[PDB]
Design a protein around this ligand. Sequence first.
Ligand SMILES: [Ca+2]
Ligand SMILES: [Ca+2]
Ligand code: NA
Length: 994
Amino acid sequence: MEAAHSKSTEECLAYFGVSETTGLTPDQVKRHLEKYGHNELPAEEGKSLWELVIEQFEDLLVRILLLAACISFVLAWFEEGEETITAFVEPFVILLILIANAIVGVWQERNAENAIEALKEYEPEMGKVYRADRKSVQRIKARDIVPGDIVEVAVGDKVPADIRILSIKSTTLRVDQSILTGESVSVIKHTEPVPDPRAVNQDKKNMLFSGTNIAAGKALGIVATTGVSTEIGKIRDQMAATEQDKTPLQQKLDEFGEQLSKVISLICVAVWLINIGHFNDPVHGGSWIRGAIYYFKIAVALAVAAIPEGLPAVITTCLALGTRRMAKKNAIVRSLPSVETLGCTSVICSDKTGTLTTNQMSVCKMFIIDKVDGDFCSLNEFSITGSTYAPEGEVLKNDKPIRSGQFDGLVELATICALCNDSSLDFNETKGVYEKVGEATETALTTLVEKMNVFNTEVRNLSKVERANACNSVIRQLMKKEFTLEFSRDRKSMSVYCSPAKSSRAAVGNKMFVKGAPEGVIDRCNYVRVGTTRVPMTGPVKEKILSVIKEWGTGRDTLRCLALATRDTPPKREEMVLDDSSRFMEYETDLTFVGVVGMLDPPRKEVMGSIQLCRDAGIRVIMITGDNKGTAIAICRRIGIFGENEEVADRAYTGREFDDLPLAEQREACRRACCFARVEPSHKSKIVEYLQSYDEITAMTGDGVNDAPALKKAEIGIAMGSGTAVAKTASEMVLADDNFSTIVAAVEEGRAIYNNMKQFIRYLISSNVGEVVCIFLTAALGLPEALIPVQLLWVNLVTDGLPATALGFNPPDLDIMDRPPRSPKEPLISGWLFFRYMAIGGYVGAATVGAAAWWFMYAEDGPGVTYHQLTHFMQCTEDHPHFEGLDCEIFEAPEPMTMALSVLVTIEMCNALNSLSENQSLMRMPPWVNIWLLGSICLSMSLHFLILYVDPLPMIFKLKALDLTQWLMVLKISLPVIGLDEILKFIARNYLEG
Ligand SMILES: [Ca+2]
Ligand SMILES: [Ca+2]
Ligand code: NA
């Protein structure tokens, strides 16, 4: 649709043939989407520096490698010598392996695109519309909104696509077009057409331009244009693919690739140079070319082995799957470039209500008198689980569940809470959640009796709507309330006068149930209830009761307490003044103390644990609440932000106090603050500013238009899944949960994703490092070369493939939240890490050149055994009186090479087990933790076996099956690679971090 602003509502509806009371049909949507595409901009090409300096470079290499092989394949024809056979299939074997490499490459790239695809499911559905499907509004991804269907916009929403306003349901509809036209001053709309077709957006006040925000009202409309066809998309098209920007990690990675592209090139060009003295050997026929050709094939083959392939794919895969787990836990992170930042979070500033706290008053403790003797009493104390108004949870005594019917005192406690109460519960079928009806403080009582269920009423098989007030009803049917003595500030308590239900004894069994602040109520009690009996109140008894009420309203929980009492013999109704509350205290006298309930707005699920996790991880937690300072502090001791007894009159501030401080102090307050109470919305921005001024990577929560600035400023802006869309747009994450615990879990995944990358890099670099020195360890010394081209390619295929990919699937480390947050500034590879690389490799490199030299030096039950100089072996055909019964060509035996290659392979398969964790000993993180890794180790081992025990093969790669005795020589030479690293792990896990 075009110029919809010019046409009328009727015209626009006719354009796509749709009534605003039915909406687009399935047939229509299918076609329109096909014809108009999705509502979004095109994804820009992703040709990184790594793809050109690494990926493209290795491709070229393997081509010229095959080319070198074909050159000599042709020269092997003009060779009047004996028609060889092994070097005759070389060109074929090379092309073959290269195919295998490709198979693995596509597999990895397919995992990545598939992992990415599985993400579209969790993308936020910011867009409501009416389609012929349902006769009720429907939610859908903004990208799935095709021009034509009917959309519904409301307050605090973001315009998904360009829409022509059809009907304004509210009295007025204001919009914020600042993002495009140029002004935050909301604009008024109408549904009339704008005659001038060539008019500016600021004049098309009958259209809702995508990317704009609703300042007020509700409206119905029809989609005119989507995607880049958008009015904003045609301004955002100037930023479409014309850009130059990369995340801090991408810059480090490219810097790494570019520097690897140099190290490999050099060391390899060096291999061909330090061997020019072998271009004329007899084993090459004495050709100054065929010899240079042979080594060129090694220098390029070593390069291929060296180069760590599959990085982009593995990283993208870890990142994509990692983000899935986040969404699986309600952490919705749209921008992948954000998880990097998320992983470095060092400060989380969180609102209290609904995020740290449930905001649903709950009774968690209660007590009744147990026994009374000698004017002293013991108490029956109980705790109740469950943290919402929902009738779910149980009563416990000494942490063991008990039935409340078992204590007659509790039956009366429940009676009183069910009757002295003007509230009720209600299950909202829409939201599928229990909600309160009336004061939260009373509903906590309603919900408590539901959990108590003193008369063991059957509810397990009841409806969610019936269950809501089930138990309260049972009680209301046994007792009839005839009137209420309204709460009075004079006495701080209230009461209900009741009588037995369906009772014919009008003047028999009448009671008054009292609830109120502890002091006044306790003071008007001359009796104490014990089970169903009553004994006089005594000082000691009154003192005990009051002390536990102190402990509760003072301890780390600061529970709000209510005393519940009963006037056993209430006055006659005829003798009660019902219009003068100042007379109520008297009517509520001569009471019998029954019990005390202690309630609070409890922490959300896992919040308290998540907070300890934060502290363990060096992540500061800052609470922002509306409560007064004194209570905010209470709430912080309660959830764990502040210790039970910890001076915090320096880490908590009200906006009043904060505003009274000068710039340097305010900033100073933020480097150490843990709590901000009664604060202004403009304060969140200052807080973020000051935090950032200390290099803290900041996460800030928000849910309204007033929070957008701060969520934008913050490195990790966190919007409530239940808040306005304006906030969500301005953020890096959305809590589908609204739960603070979900933020901490997201930070954890972020750290986890980073690690897998590092472990992935360590294995590939440490291993391949040795491969390189190995070739040099024999060249520098002078020993006989232990690896030929096809052998190098074989190691590559077997060690840089599936095994490495598998590390991408490594579980979360164990000390992941026991380390401080990573600094975006620190280098990709720390000096200690580079040492850990040059150490693990330095070994495998020698453990290989040595694995073959062993066959020649201190051989065991095997030939050769000339442990003297092998250095000048190129002189065995110059002075043979040095050997004792063996042919010089013994150095050309496939025995040695079969060892070096079998060690080089099994050892790297071992080093892969060292990469299951960064610092955790295989003892703590068993190798069977990554099943995929083990499976890859098999496949790799099987293939190496097949390449040895399948007659045709062993001749191709110049090898020979080794007996059960020669294999154990590999292990005793390979297993120590674990030991070596396992030691370094001890060094770091103990002397470096701790
Ligand atoms: Ca490689
Ligand atoms: Ca390797
Ligand atoms: Na932000």
